[PDB]
Design a protein around this nucleic acid. Sequence first.
DNA 1: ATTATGACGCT
DNA 2: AGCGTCAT
Length: 430
Amino acid sequence: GPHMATGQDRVVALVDMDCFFVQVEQRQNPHLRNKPCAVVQYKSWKGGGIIAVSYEARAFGVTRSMWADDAKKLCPDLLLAQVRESRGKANLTKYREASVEVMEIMSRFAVIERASIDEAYVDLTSAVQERLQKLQGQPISADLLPSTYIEGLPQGPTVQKEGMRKQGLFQWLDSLQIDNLTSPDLQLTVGAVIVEEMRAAIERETGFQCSAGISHNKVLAKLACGLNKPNRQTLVSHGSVPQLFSQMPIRKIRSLGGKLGASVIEILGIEYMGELTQFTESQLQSHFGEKNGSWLYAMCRGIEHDPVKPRQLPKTIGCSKNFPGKTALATREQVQWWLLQLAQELEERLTKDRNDNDRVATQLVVSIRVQGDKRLSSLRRCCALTRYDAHKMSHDAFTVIKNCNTSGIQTEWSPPLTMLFLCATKFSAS
DNA sequence: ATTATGACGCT
DNA sequence: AGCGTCAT
Ligand SMILES: Nc1ncnc2c1ncn2[C@H]1C[C@H](O)[C@@H](COP(=O)(O)OP(=O)(O)OP(=O)(O)O)O1
Ligand SMILES: [Ca+2]
Ligand SMILES: [Mg+2]
């Protein structure tokens, strides 16, 4: 009843760029704009691996992870842009720098948590309170929400999508009580107005379009964001949760896309998020552990407490290359050359990071994979990172891994290496 | 023969 | 610490 918390204390948004790497390439090369196009890395093997796909191309069934030669079978006129190559490896600098552009604009509106290269969570709670004071009990015009969907509406008593969007919006605004400044539905609505403004600013100043979700926590904001893409934003109210979750596959919720989600389905014999409400907190804890059990118990009711962490910069800077099939490194000279290439890119990124962000990494992590292992990493060892120098870093990396060489021969490397990975971590202010 | 990342949890 | 999971 009156003591039962409802997880409506915050307004949280998740902003995610539409087909991000593609938009970066389309801004640079107008010939790619408004075309079925994809971004690919490498080229020799099957025309390269697709990593981002424009919405026009998705209509043909082109997807991420598809080989470009295969995508071309679905979409003969597919245009491609290739990821830059430096020191023999894909170099993602252009996209990282474009990411910074967006993150800096968002940070003008509120504190953000960088969640990936192309998305950030936003805690809008305080910004909403402020805007509410400005409004002075003034109603919110639908004009202020020109790209917003209200999940679950319209309902009750309509052919085209934009018209549906507006009907839903009008039902929502018609029911709002703007008299109450602590009304969670009102707070979300004002949050959506701010997110419209943030999204407009992003597009004006970068050229990039994005989608967004607005709700009361990160998981719902994230789910909302994906409900209407591209170039639209979705508000998921506390009230919409029971209907939304009643047919929502468990795997769609962030963190349940893998083995745990699979275990939830298997052990409990259920399919949808809403079916979780029927179990006690202790029951869920017994199957999935104290922490997961509590989290699932609240989450299936639309409640989640993870804070938007104030962190705009990545916590690690890493460089990685796979050496698949026949290209696996089988000589010490090979291993040393590629560690150097990786270390050189890393030094470059580290030096720029130190200048821009006044911090220095203190730990170097070195990871490899050996031919045969089905695991991402076979071995992960750390050493001290005392100087931003590529030759030293690569020499150190070699030293920590050199014992993995089964070969009785000094020159040879066995079993061959199918992945190398250098990662700088444990930053300190400088 | 996706690849190149990046965060966080467990013990 | 080194490993595993989940994600973009
Ligand atoms: N598995 C991956 N491997 C390599 N790069 C990836 C991978 N997943 C995502 N990326 C890169 C390319 C994407 O443009 C960018 C953002 O990813 P993501 O948000 O999942 O999709 P997207 O922005 O391309 O399309 P959407 O409009 O569906 O969000 O990160
Ligand atoms: Ca995206
Ligand atoms: Mg994303």
